Design a protein around this ligand. Structure first.
Ligand SMILES: Cc1cc2nc3c(=O)[nH]c(=O)nc-3n(C[C@H](O)[C@H](O)[C@H](O)COP(=O)(O)OP(=O)(O)OC[C@H]3O[C@@H](n4cnc5c(N)ncnc54)[C@H](O)[C@@H]3O)c2cc1C
Ligand SMILES: [Cl-]
Length: 488
């Protein structure tokens, strides 16, 4: 008799899940498993992202219950729980999606060793990325492309990515009954209060495959907008209706198939011959994701500076005071402080909004290491991706992929081009709601009578700017220029 385990780590969905389809094939009992460590906080992670994970697990639970099954949330470490459930459940096959992150390679190699001792077959298909990333490297002569131009030319030679896998059957083989490790009281999905958090999440994006597909269809309600999508032209100040899809948290956890996303993009492109082309198209944005996954997975110490063969060694300053003001959104620049407040409130900001805060902290004004601001992003971002977070921080700090350090965003003028009235600032910084638009981006320039009238006196209700952007940016550009000559 065949008894299988479908192990969820990423790929928290039922659609386009070849690991789930194999586990259900000729199976008498299937055990949907998610391994949860009950001591994760007692050792980092915000309640926004972690509750986003729990909502994604609750969505899988209701989907498995509608097919006669049930999701098992096991507590402990995979190295300690799986050797037990192999014998207890009589497992003959273990299936899970392939992951290329550093911790996953150490973890999955250990579990495969344990599965071989128990005589369990291991099937690990590829469906988190568009292509087999090792195949793309081998097709390129054994090395990953280091530019988007060459990378886009590589995938065009390989062809279309595999089509998404079909849906699982309407009825699944349920877990065996009266199994001690599958007791419902020990395998349920916990709430955010039970895992240890004390403050409630404030984000407006709900997790789960159902919400991911609902947001996918909403983006495709206007095929003209999908075909003519151009990433650099979108509005970072739009918050009532974000200018992009905001599918990043669902692609990070696997709530949405990247291959299903790509398949729907090609259907619209076929009926719109003037559609946008990479790297600015919507398909191009999925290729940025695939590109950073390909380079990051084959580069040692990608997430760091030292020992990173692609990251330039810059003598970033160790200034805890500048980092603290930037982290706590008290820089004195309302454009930056509002974006950082959106980071801690929603866990998601627009791409160009992330450019503004990352440039200001690194090569723009404060000259703080990109590793420090990234630890802040890894804490609060609900779409936090090990490879995408690191690769884009090296981009904005002019350490890798990007080298035009003479391009420095202004924390005053940038947002004013989109939102001259400062509506975005007034939403996330309510202390400036009564400030006139002439001074909403430069509140320290307002006369004292205006500050009093608006109920926002600089230095009392809102902090003064920590630096002079004209003075700070010139010093950073001179130091970046001296760093690019000492490389060679
Ligand atoms: C400093 C910095 C840190 C970032 N950290 C992350 C991160 O941890 N997780 C993350 O998903 N993205 C990250 N990005 C990329 C980008 O900010 C987001 O992917 C994007 O803002 C998400 O909104 P969206 O889903 O509407 O994007 P869309 O424009 O709708 O793009 C569609 C999808 O393509 C991918 N994508 C888009 N732009 C990029 C990009 N520049 N690089 C890689 N993939 C991209 C994402 O999966 C996204 O969901 C970072 C960018 C910067 C500048
Ligand atoms: Cl600018």
């Amino acid at each position: 008799v065949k008894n299988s385990i479908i192990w969820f780590r990423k790929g928290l969905r039922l659609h386009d899940n070849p690991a789930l389809l194999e586990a259900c094939k000729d199976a008498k009992h299937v055990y949907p498993v998610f391994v949860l460590d009950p001591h994760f906080l007692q050792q980092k992670v915000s309640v926004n992202r972690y509750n986003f994970l729990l909502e994604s697990l609750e969505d899988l639970q209701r989907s498995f219950q509608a097919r006669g099954s049930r999701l098992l949330v096991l507590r402990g470490k995979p190295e300690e729980v799986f050797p037990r459930v192999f014998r207890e459940w009589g497992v003959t096959q273990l299936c899970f999606e392939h992951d290329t992150e550093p911790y996953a390679k150490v973890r999955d190699a250990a579990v495969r060793r344990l599965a071989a001792e128990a005589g369990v077959e291991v099937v690990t298909p590829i469906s988190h990325t568009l292509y087999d990333t090792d195949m793309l490297v081998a097709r390129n002569g054994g090395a990953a492309p280091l530019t988007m131009q060459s990378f886009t030319k590589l995938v065009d030679r390989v062809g279309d990515p595999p089509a998404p896998a079909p849906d699982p059957p309407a009825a699944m083989p349920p877990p065996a009954e009266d199994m001690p490790s599958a007791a419902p009281a020990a395998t349920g999905v916990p709430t955010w209060q039970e895992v240890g958090f004390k403050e409630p999440p404030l984000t407006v994006f709900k997790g789960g495959e159902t919400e991911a597909l609902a947001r996918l269809e909403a983006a495709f309600q206007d095929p003209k907008w999908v075909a003519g999508f151009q990433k650099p032209d979108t509005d970072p100040s739009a918050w009532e209706k974000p200018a992009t899809t905001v599918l990043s948290p669902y692609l990070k956890f696997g709530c949405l198939s990247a291959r299903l996303f790509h398949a729907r993009l090609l259907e619209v492109y076929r009926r719109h011959p003037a559609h946008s082309q990479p790297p600015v198209s919507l398909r191009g944005q999925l290729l940025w994701r695939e590109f950073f996954y390909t380079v990051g997975s084959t580069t040692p110490n990608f997430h760091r500076m030292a020992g990173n063969p692609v990251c330039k060694q810059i003598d970033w300053d160790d200034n805890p005071e500048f980092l603290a003001a930037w982290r706590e959104a008290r820089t004195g620049f309302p454009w930056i402080d509002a974006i950082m407040t959106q980071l801690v409130t929603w866990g998601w900001m627009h791409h160009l909004a992330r450019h503004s805060v990352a440039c200001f902290l690194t090569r723009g004004d404060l000259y703080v290491s990109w590793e420090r601001g990234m630890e802040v992003f890894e804490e609060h971002l609900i779409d936090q991706d090990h490879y995408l977070n690191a690769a884009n921080w090296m981009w904005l700090s002019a350490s890798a992929f990007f080298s035009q350090y003479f391009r420095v965003y202004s924390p005053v003028v940038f947002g004013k081009k989109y939102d001259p009235e400062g509506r975005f600032i007034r939403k996330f910084l309510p202390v400036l709601k009564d400030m006139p638009a002439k001074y909403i981006y430069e509140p320290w320039t307002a006369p004292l009578e205006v500050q009093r009238k608006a109920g926002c006196v600089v230095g009392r209700d809102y902090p003064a700017p920590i630096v002079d952007h004209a003075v700070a940016s010139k010093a950073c550009i001179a130091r970046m220029a001296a760093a690019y000559r000492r490389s060679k």
